[PDB]
Design a protein around this ligand. Sequence first.
Ligand SMILES: NC(=O)C1=CN([C@@H]2O[C@H](COP(=O)(O)OP(=O)(O)OC[C@H]3O[C@@H](n4cnc5c(N)ncnc54)[C@H](OP(=O)(O)O)[C@@H]3O)[C@@H](O)[C@H]2O)C=CC1
Ligand SMILES: CCc1nc(N)nc(N)c1C#C[C@H](C)c1cc(OC)cc(-c2ccncc2)c1
Ligand SMILES: [Ca+2]
Length: 186
Amino acid sequence: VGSLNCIVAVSQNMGIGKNGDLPWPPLRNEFRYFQRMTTTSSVEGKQNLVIMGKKTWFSIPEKNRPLKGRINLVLSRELKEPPQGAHFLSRSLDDALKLTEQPELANKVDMVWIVGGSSVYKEAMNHPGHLKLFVTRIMQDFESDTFFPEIDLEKYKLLPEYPGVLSDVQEEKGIKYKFEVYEKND
Ligand SMILES: NC(=O)C1=CN([C@@H]2O[C@H](COP(=O)(O)OP(=O)(O)OC[C@H]3O[C@@H](n4cnc5c(N)ncnc54)[C@H](OP(=O)(O)O)[C@@H]3O)[C@@H](O)[C@H]2O)C=CC1
Ligand SMILES: CCc1nc(N)nc(N)c1C#C[C@H](C)c1cc(OC)cc(-c2ccncc2)c1
Ligand SMILES: [Ca+2]
C-alpha cells in the first residue's frame, strides 16, 4: 500500500460523534458521498479496504455491518478475533497495512480508507508517505463527545478543487456543508 485515505464529517466545533452516533441529523447525500468514495475501486476484481476503530464498528447499525462492497477491518488492542461480521482485526494501523501484503489479501485490495474514529485518524494522519484527507466541513456547531484531531498545515495542504469532488457549499435539511480535500506527500 503506497497511499492512504482518510474520510470524515466534522462540525464547526470539531465534533464527529455524540453518544455513539453522529451529532447531526442524517444527511443522505453526505452519506452517499461517503459510500461512493470508500466503495469505488479503480481495479476490477478488487475491493477497497475500510479501517475503523472498535466503537465506530459498533456505531454502524448491525444490519449494515459489515459495510457492503468493502473489506472491513477493525482496530483493537483488546479484541482477540474480529467482531462478528468484520473481515479482519489488527492491533495497529501498521499491522493492518502489513496484513494487506499477506497471502489472503494479496491482490484483493485496491484503496485503503480510514473511516474513524478519533484515535484512528490521529495515527493515520501521521503515517508516512502520501495521504489524502477527505473532510466534510459541517458549517455549524453540534453537541459532541468525540472530536477530529486538528489538521497540521505544516504537513497538509488544502487542495483548491479536486476531480470528482464538488466545490460549492451543499445543503441538506437546512444544514450547510462543504467537501474539502487535504494532501501530504511525505
Ligand atoms: N463524523 C464521522 O465522519 C464519523 C463519526 N464517528 C463517530 O465517532 C464515534 C466513534 O469514534 P471514537 O469514539 O473516536 O472511537 P473509535 O472508533 O476510534 O474506537 C475507539 C477504540 O478503537 C480502538 N482503537 C482506536 N484507535 C486505535 C489505534 N490507533 N490502534 C489500535 N486500536 C485503536 C480501541 O479499542 P480497544 O479499547 O478495544 O483497544 C479504542 O478503544 C461514534 O460516535 C461514531 O458515530 C465515527 C466515524 C466517522
Ligand atoms: C456518512 C458518515 C460519514 N461521512 C463522512 N464524510 N466520513 C465518514 N467517515 C462517515 C462515517 C462513518 C461511520 C463509519 C458510520 C457511522 C454511523 O453512525 C450511525 C453509521 C454509518 C453507516 C450507517 C449505515 N450504512 C453505512 C454506514 C457509518
Ligand atoms: Ca490515495
